Amino acid sequence: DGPTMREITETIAEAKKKVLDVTKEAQANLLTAKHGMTLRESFEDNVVRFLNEARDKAGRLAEVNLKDLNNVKQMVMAGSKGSFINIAQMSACVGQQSVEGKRIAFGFVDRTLPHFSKDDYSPESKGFVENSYLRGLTPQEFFFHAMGGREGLIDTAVKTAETGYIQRRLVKALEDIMVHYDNTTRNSLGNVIQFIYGEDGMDAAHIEKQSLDTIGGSDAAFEKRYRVDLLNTDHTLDPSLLESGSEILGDLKLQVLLDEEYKQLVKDRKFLREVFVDGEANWPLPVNIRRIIQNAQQTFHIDHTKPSDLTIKDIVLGVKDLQENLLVLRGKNEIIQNAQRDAVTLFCCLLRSRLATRRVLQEYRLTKQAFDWVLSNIEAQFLRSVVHPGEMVGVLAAQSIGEPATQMTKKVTSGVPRLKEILNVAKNMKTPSLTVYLEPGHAADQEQAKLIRSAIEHTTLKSVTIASEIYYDPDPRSTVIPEDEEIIQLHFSLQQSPWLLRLELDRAAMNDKDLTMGQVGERIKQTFKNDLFVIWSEDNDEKLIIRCRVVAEEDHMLKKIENTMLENITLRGVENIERVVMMKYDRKVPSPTGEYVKEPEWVLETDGVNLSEVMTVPGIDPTRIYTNSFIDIMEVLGIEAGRAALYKEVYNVIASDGSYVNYRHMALLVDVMTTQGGLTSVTRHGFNRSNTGALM
Amino acid sequence: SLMSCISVGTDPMPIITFLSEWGMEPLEDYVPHQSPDATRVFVNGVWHGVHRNPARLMETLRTLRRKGDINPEVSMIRDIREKELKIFTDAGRVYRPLFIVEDDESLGHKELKVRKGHIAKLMATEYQDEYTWSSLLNEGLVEYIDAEEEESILIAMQPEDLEPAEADVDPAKRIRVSHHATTFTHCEIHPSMILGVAASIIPFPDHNQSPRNTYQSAMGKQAMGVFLTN
Amino acid sequence: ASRHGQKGTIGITYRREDMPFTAEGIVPDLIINPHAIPSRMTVAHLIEC
Amino acid sequence: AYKARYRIIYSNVISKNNPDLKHKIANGDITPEFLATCDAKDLAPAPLKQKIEEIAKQNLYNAQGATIERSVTDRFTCGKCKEKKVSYYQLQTRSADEPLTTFCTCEACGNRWKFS
Amino acid sequence: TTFRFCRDCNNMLYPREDKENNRLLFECRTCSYVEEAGSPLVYRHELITNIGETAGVVQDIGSDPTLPRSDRECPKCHSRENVFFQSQQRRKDTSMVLFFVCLSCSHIFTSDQKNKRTQ
Amino acid sequence: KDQDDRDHFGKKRLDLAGPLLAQLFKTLFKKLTKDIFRYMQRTVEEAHD
Amino acid sequence: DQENERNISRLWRAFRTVKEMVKDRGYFITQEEVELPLEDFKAKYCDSMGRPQRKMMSFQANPTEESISKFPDMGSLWVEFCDEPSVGVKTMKTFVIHIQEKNFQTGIFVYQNNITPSAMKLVPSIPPATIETFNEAALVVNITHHELVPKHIRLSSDEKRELLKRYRLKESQLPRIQRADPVALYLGLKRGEVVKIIRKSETSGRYASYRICM
Ligand SMILES: [Mg+2]
Ligand SMILES: [Zn+2]
Ligand SMILES: [Zn+2]
Ligand SMILES: [Zn+2]
Numbered sequence A: 001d002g003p004t005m006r007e008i009t010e011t012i013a014e015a016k017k018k019v020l021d022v023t024k025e026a027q028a029n030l031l032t033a034k035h036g037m038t039l040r041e042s043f044e045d046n047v048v049r050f051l052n053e054a055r056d057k058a059g060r061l062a063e064v065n066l067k068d069l070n071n072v073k074q075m076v077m078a079g080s081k082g083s084f085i086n087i088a089q090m091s092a093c094v095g096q097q098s099v100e101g102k103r104i105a106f107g108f109v110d111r112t113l114p115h116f117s118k119d120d121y122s123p124e125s126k127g128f129v130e131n132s133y134l135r136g137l138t139p140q141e142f143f144f145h146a147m148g149g150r151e152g153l154i155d156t157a158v159k160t161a162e163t164g165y166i167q168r169r170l171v172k173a174l175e176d177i178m179v180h181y182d183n184t185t186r187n188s189l190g191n192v193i194q195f196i197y198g199e200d201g202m203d204a205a206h207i208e209k210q211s212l213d214t215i216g217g218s219d220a221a222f223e224k225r226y227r228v229d230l231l232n233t234d235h236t237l238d239p240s241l242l243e244s245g246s247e248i249l250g251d252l253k254l255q256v257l258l259d260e261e262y263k264q265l266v267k268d269r270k271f272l273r274e275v276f277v278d279g280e281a282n283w284p285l286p287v288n289i290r291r292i293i294q295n296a297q298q299t300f301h302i303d304h305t306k307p308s309d310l311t312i313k314d315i316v317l318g319v320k321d322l323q324e325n326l327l328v329l330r331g332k333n334e335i336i337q338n339a340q341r342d343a344v345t346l347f348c349c350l351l352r353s354r355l356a357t358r359r360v361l362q363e364y365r366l367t368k369q370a371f372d373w374v375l376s377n378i379e380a381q382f383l384r385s386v387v388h389p390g391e392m393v394g395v396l397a398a399q400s401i402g403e404p405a406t407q408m409t410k411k412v413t414s415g416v417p418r419l420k421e422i423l424n425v426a427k428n429m430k431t432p433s434l435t436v437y438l439e440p441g442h443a444a445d446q447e448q449a450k451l452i453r454s455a456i457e458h459t460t461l462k463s464v465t466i467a468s469e470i471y472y473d474p475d476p477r478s479t480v481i482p483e484d485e486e487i488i489q490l491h492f493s494l495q496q497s498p499w500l501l502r503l504e505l506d507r508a509a510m511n512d513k514d515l516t517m518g519q520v521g522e523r524i525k526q527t528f529k530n531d532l533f534v535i536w537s538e539d540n541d542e543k544l545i546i547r548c549r550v551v552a553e554e555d556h557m558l559k560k561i562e563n564t565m566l567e568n569i570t571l572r573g574v575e576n577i578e579r580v581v582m583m584k585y586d587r588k589v590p591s592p593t594g595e596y597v598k599e600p601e602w603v604l605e606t607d608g609v610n611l612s613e614v615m616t617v618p619g620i621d622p623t624r625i626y627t628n629s630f631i632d633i634m635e636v637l638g639i640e641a642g643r644a645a646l647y648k649e650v651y652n653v654i655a656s657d658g659s660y661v662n663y664r665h666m667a668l669l670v671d672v673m674t675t676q677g678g679l680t681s682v683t684r685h686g687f688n689r690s691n692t693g694a695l696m
Numbered sequence B: 001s002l003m004s005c006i007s008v009g010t011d012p013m014p015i016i017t018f019l020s021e022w023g024m025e026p027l028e029d030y031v032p033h034q035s036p037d038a039t040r041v042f043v044n045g046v047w048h049g050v051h052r053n054p055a056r057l058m059e060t061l062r063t064l065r066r067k068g069d070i071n072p073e074v075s076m077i078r079d080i081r082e083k084e085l086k087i088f089t090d091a092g093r094v095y096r097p098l099f100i101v102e103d104d105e106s107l108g109h110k111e112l113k114v115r116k117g118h119i120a121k122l123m124a125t126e127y128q129d130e131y132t133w134s135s136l137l138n139e140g141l142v143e144y145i146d147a148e149e150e151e152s153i154l155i156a157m158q159p160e161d162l163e164p165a166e167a168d169v170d171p172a173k174r175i176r177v178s179h180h181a182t183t184f185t186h187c188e189i190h191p192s193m194i195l196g197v198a199a200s201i202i203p204f205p206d207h208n209q210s211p212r213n214t215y216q217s218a219m220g221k222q223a224m225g226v227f228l229t230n
Numbered sequence C: 001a002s003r004h005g006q007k008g009t010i011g012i013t014y015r016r017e018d019m020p021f022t023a024e025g026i027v028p029d030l031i032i033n034p035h036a037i038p039s040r041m042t043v044a045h046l047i048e049c
Numbered sequence D: 001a002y003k004a005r006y007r008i009i010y011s012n013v014i015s016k017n018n019p020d021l022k023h024k025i026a027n028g029d030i031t032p033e034f035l036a037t038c039d040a041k042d043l044a045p046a047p048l049k050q051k052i053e054e055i056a057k058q059n060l061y062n063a064q065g066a067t068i069e070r071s072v073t074d075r076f077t078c079g080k081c082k083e084k085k086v087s088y089y090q091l092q093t094r095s096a097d098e099p100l101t102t103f104c105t106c107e108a109c110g111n112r113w114k115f116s
Numbered sequence E: 001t002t003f004r005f006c007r008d009c010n011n012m013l014y015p016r017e018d019k020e021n022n023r024l025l026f027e028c029r030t031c032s033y034v035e036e037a038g039s040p041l042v043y044r045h046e047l048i049t050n051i052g053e054t055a056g057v058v059q060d061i062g063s064d065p066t067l068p069r070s071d072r073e074c075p076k077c078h079s080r081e082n083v084f085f086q087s088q089q090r091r092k093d094t095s096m097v098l099f100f101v102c103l104s105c106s107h108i109f110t111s112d113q114k115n116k117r118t119q
Numbered sequence F: 001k002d003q004d005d006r007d008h009f010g011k012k013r014l015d016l017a018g019p020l021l022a023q024l025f026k027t028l029f030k031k032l033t034k035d036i037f038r039y040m041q042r043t044v045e046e047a048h049d
Numbered sequence G: 001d002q003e004n005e006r007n008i009s010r011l012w013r014a015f016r017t018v019k020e021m022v023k024d025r026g027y028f029i030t031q032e033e034v035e036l037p038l039e040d041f042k043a044k045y046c047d048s049m050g051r052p053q054r055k056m057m058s059f060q061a062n063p064t065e066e067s068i069s070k071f072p073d074m075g076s077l078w079v080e081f082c083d084e085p086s087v088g089v090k091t092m093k094t095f096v097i098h099i100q101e102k103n104f105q106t107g108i109f110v111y112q113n114n115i116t117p118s119a120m121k122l123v124p125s126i127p128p129a130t131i132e133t134f135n136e137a138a139l140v141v142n143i144t145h146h147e148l149v150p151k152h153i154r155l156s157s158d159e160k161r162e163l164l165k166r167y168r169l170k171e172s173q174l175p176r177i178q179r180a181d182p183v184a185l186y187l188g189l190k191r192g193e194v195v196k197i198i199r200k201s202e203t204s205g206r207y208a209s210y211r212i213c214m
Helices: A002-027 A039-065 A071-078 A084-092 A139-174 A219-226 A252-275 A289-299 A312-324 A334-354 A357-363 A368-385 A393-406 A416-423 A446-456 A485-490 A507-512 A517-531 A555-568 A611-615 A630-637 A639-656 A663-674 B013-021 B054-067 B116-127 B133-138 B210-222 C043-048 D049-061 E059-063 F017-045 G002-025 G038-045 G065-070 G089-101 G157-167 G182-186
Strands: A192-194 A207-211 A282-286 A434-437 A465-472 A499-505 A532-536 A544-550 A578-585 A588-590 A596-598 A601-607 B024-026 B039-043 B047-051 B075-079 B084-088 B094-102 B142-146 D086-089 D103-106 D112-114 E013-018 E023-028 E034-036 E041-044 E082-086 E098-102 E108-110 G059-061 G077-081 G106-111 G130-135 G151-154 G194-201 G205-213
Touching (some): A002 A039, A071 A084, A139 A393, A139 A416, A139 A663, A192 A663, A219 A252, A219 A357, A252 A334, A252 G194, A282 A368, A312 A334, A312 A368, A393 A639, A393 A663, A416 A639, A446 D049, A485 A544, A517 A544, A639 A663, B013 B024, B013 B039, B013 B047, G002 G077, G077 G089, G157 G194
Parallel strands (some): B039 B084, G106 G130
Antiparallel strands (some): A207 A282, A499 A544, A588 A596, B024 B047, B039 B047, B094 B142
């Protein structure tokens, strides 16, 4: 539209000013950097953010103005081709161009092109393509889009071989893995990788995302859905629900059975809440029970009026019995029988939730034959659902991770290069980071977060110092620097070197990394003990100074002392831990009323790793603390945790690209790297150096 | 790109001989603290000496090139901030020709040396098939600028659109910037010349997504047609 | 291919009678799919035309 | 121791314171015683209290971790938290013949995915 | 700092303490030369530097076409004719403060609305 | 000052047909020069004209 | 007061974890014994200055009724702490013979900073009895309590024999826990000993894996 184009132009126009406004603000030194960022880094972030907010607004304007008759909108609507951005870029505005994440940089001295003035941080100078493809690009817009365009072609080109080799290594490490006739996953050595395929003994094709009802809702809402009380006139099953309704009231013997039923359902709820901590209900499980019920309903032409011919015993026991027939493992012995129970656990919680008495009668309105049929079908389906001995689950898993890696395009190393880091069990990783969760109580307390941030983020005498100076001040009692005259007059009233080491500290720096002259001085004093005489200017006093003296030949001696001071003296924090950011992560937690509710917390984000040390810090949750470096998790928390971290990490790489790979595949890889007792890499060094066959 | 050429490589001596004669103190007699603001002069990464008033020297050297006395393929750059004057007689440097703009105009502002009279003077020679490209080059209307020299210049994209200041607007046309600069040393002959042989057959490449253009400049190489009449 | 990185092979060849036609009696030499254009954002192809 | 215481214271016174111382015285013783214791110183120381107390604040500040701020488009939807508050960023995953992958992120529930 | 050399050698000077009269000297380690110190300051480190900001400000600064202009009235001659640039100290941290150089009086003024300068 | 941009085009040269032949001709002419010398020894020993 | 109280908190936090490990290993320790408050720790093992008296801390522990049912030959344990940050051959020879005379089966030595290589050479000197060295600093936090650390359960000679029988295995074919593994240390697993890991599954709810010691 003509007015939509005016409205778009005026959207860019206002964003263009918003940017100039932040630029004028930055040139006037009024800009205040975000903790753990350059004043400049902070600025560029804002500029980039406004310009994108703009491209999208301008886009969403056109997208709305295009009628349903728009052939492009029509393709986007069906999902046949194209997305929002395509409309936006074509109709309204192309947007900001990036190379290496940052805007077009100054290839020429202080400018992007020779058509610009130096020190031009304007959108037009750093690659913002204001125009739509329909309108056309200016030569500058054209070349910047060309730079940005070339970047993608480079990774498309490279990724292609990197991605290829990743695939090979996964395949060669897993090839010999398959399910044997004992449901055990073993390699060419008969070494057990997984005891049962993908911890459930099921084939992945036969699985579907299903909702575990029991898991969520209020404790009251659960009760209404599941509780049958034949000893209470209000909470009995109405005689409209089943034929025996009238004769069922007050049956103490029967009530014993509904008590077991409800007690199990409550047991299950707690258990599932232990497994899925967030309260996520939707999980991939075999047998779509929802569909079986739906079918029973049309198959049997279920009359949602007349009462059922079911007994409470018919339902209660029927389910109890079906459960014993859901066979994954067959052996006649405690080990194998307990194993069978284990594999079937989760599926049963679902089964018991969907087939509880109240549910079957009130909701499903099933007849005895309908129910009898539903039961047989769950059984049949479940059995068909188990993995087939012979399944080459090894290659499957490798290819199931390999193929998605092939489609791959706080700021942490992710995607293809991270997967590379992971598989290689890379010692010197690119983005090491700790995720420090706070102590239970003080979870919402921002001031507590700051306290730990301060107690953990590394601080050196160097980070606070403006400059150090060596002076010849021969009288320890009287000073050649008239400034210092007052500092002596006090730090004397209420033998040593004539050579003075005088350092000036930055008040602004001494504040962001909260510190006192007293505490800084104390560290130096406590470092050099009784072989260095330290004095310091007060936190109040205008200039921030620390005067130091030792206890023939002394010039070089003091130059060593100043290097020790700047480089080796640690003030606050833990070693290896730099840039600590405070973060308000959202956490799903059960409320007193039962329902899972958003209760966000303050979380710390590290720029480095030291597990052993940060764990022992007061004020954190040492039960919750996580690092992306699984090599550390392994070393500190054992091989079991090493496995859990290694999976978490692998899973993230896939899900970050917005892809889904079934658990089992990632689980298997993770397990194979694990089994040996450590971190066996998917490299010529790791797997290929095991006890397998020589030709292999 | 279409207008790109590569420096054949000339002789440095006529320039070294010229320099010494134009106020260049030889390095052999340099005394850093005596002349401390001295602009250091290089010819092919060889420091030959220093000069006290580079402003005037630079103008003489530029007039030498724009006349033809100093070859047009020779690159000479003056980084004022760094106090350096580097000269390249050197072979292998990629250069492009640009229109020269001069503050020099009795009547008004800073204006492109080339005038509508030269343009008709060329199209007269276009009808003949006496005024060549060399004719524009020796009349110092146009110049050769390599990447190192590009660093110190300031180019206008369009001449007419980027010259006289402001003393309604079509909505269908693309959003364009301005001629805010009063400093303009050069002007772009035509911005489409940034493109190579293959990309120059792409119709409206300013209306395509960046790689779709990169694709065509690869496919057209595999397109059938008459390759030669023989 | 067109001059817009819009490449492809022939899927079928139809005679003039099978082809869709303008009231004016004009028929296409080539039928290209709408699905090319959006994801690709080759606007100049449409303008060329 | 004582011584120381015483011384120282014483010383212181011285210183210055013175015055115171013176016263012482016166015173018572117581114162011382116381111283021783414381221591015383603050108381013791013053009058520093203000500054010393104010200086802590700048340090709180320097302790918080950058907030990735991002837009949400009202024509883009999540697969769980079924809400129209999602962010996206496109990259060139495939060769120059298919163009623009476009990755999504439910800025509220946290799922991510591709469009091709 | 600003250090001296030995007249006679031209070789650099090393500091020596005159233990008796409690005073600093500068000795030459190539000849027998000695001279008393000008300042008590022998070594200055300087971590948070400001020397580099206004570098290469040749009076010819106006002759750079690459430099941008502004209509900001000068603190001295009040001239609305000046070229501008950012802190030439090529560090990451560095603020986006601007330095304006007068196309008449040559005085260097800044845009800093937090602090007041003289360089 | 900033670290030198190893990718600045101004700091790159293009060796065309000229210099390529010059590089080859040098090593090819010194190959001939030192084969004539090997001959001048062979022909001064026996005075073989 | 200063930063003295914090080394106390840490020694107490360490002590709780020692008590936790000991009960876990299969020894008789109460919950109130573990859950001992900080104030109560101070007013027990602190001198006439509130300085930790680690010599007092050292304690003996006996197998639970339940433990002798699974492992009969499971004898008594001795846990010794030390007030000397660096422990040498002098303090070690004292503790070493102490275990041999009191006919102890196992002995843990919780050290502050180090144990000299002189003293470390006396560790495997008195068999069938066994000696363990634990750096106080590791124990401040019980790793077993972590989100990612699942239930490991040590199997008996009969339980192991059965595992291998039930799965038709050679010890080669079992996944392996490394001897030095944080949890293998916490449980004082010996080479050949097997653990049963019970982890939660997004797949099955509960999954049992086994690991043999290195
Ligand atoms: Mg292809
Ligand atoms: Zn969402
Ligand atoms: Zn001398
Ligand atoms: Zn002025």
